[PDB]
Amino acid sequence: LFEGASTYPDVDARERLNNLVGLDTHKSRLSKMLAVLVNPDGLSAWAKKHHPAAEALVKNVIRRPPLIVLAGDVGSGKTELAETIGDDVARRESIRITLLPLSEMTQLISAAFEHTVSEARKLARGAVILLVDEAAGVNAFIRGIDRLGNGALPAAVIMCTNRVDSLDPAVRRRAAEIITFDRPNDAQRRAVITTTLQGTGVTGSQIEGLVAATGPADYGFTFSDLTQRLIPSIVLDAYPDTSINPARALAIAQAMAPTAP
Template sequence: MPDQDDLFHPVIELPEDVREQRYRRLVGLDEQKIRLQKEATVLTVPDRLQQWAKKHHGGQVSALDLLGDRAPLIVFGGDVGTGKTALAESFGCDLSTRLGLPVLLYRLKLTTRGSGLVGEMTTLISDAFSVMVTEGRKAKGKNGAKSVLVMVVDEADAVAQSREQRQMHHEDRAGVDAFLEGVDSLAGEQLPVLIVMCTNRLGALDPALRRRAAATFTFGRPSPEQRRVVLTDALNGLGLKAATLDQLVKLTGERDGRVAFTYSDLTQRLVPSMVMAAFPDGPVTDDIALAVAEDMAPTPSFPEAKD
């Protein structure tokens, strides 16, 4: 049995306060959140679907077999800084509440990549899946699931890339194959295990993997309304004028032929820079806030972020 500490970051049991708050604060993802909760529920605890069929259709319906055959794989794709990691690592809080079960968050370490040992990536991936199968069987229990396991494969570009891409190394191709094998090994077992894969390169995702995904979610840059919500929250307490906020929403949008700011451009670059521009001599003024926004450029768009 492989050593879990080499494969995963410390396992986190959800719900947990910090992540719960992070989940609630994510803006513009309401539709994704609703669909994600439904998919995660039926993929990990299919009994819930049977209970539903019994209640609303009087018993077995053939649509359930089709749903039951799907692999427990969900893909998050889209541009940088749009909330993929944040959602992947926090939705388990809500899922846990809905299911009334603890959710264990396993975050795969993809760090061994680049260390030069051929086959290391493949071993890492197959080992990770065998841990999920073993732990998943324990979690399944005899009288219904005792917990649900979510494995997050973040920055999965190397693992997920199409096997046809010519520039791909031999090692990476083997990684894709190991991943497909792992997903298939889970699909047959009906375990309370869900794999969430995040990538910037949805367009480059291996077609065999795409076909297996039970659901794919795409993430984009915030609209003006969504930027307004994020900025209002982030600038709360600074006493800026309403007109300044209007202007900031505009300055962070598409202009002069460039893309709009990402969510993380707003929360991790723009607002911290405003504070740093003012600190330590005085307060963040409307002029400082506007000057910082005026000077800052958004993170360029990831070329293959779209389908």
């Protein structure tokens, strides 16, 4: 057993993906890297059509072990992104995708990789994503990743960590890509705020004030500070008898201090 396996495409995953705001770049990179890892021919074909004289442009990208690391601040949506991104990959490559979430550790890791290899052999018609929410056992994991990379099996591994320095170096150096979730920049803060406040009549000038109030002005808000503190506070301040007040929303953002690093 594993945990709760999901297949893609999925209406609920798509809805959850859509609800992630300010992560558009992280979505695109995670989705496209996964597509390359399971179907590397698509990257080779893109290279030939657009840059045929390119010698090392993709040579580095293709041969990487099929592991993607999501690293950064807690509460940024890393896990929620990893659990739903397979819907995007399924759309992008037009394949059906089985997600295996990994919930004595050495036995568990081996088993997970053995199952992943077996299912990938049965399947490029489809693909298999192994998801690891943590964190002898490191060696079982390394051997598993290498085994997926040695073969042409349509399989990839996503692993989430709060701090990339927590990861064993032999795991880190095998990541085909590391995607970082640090404090949102002005554009990312703008997207979360605009998307959330749409249809409330908040002007663009008032949005920029909240963008500035949540920036470093010297560290800014985390993604968590926006989604789990500031957004609820703004909504609840008006609920249930009042419309959203930009002056109060700004006063809330300014009095609120960011999570310290």
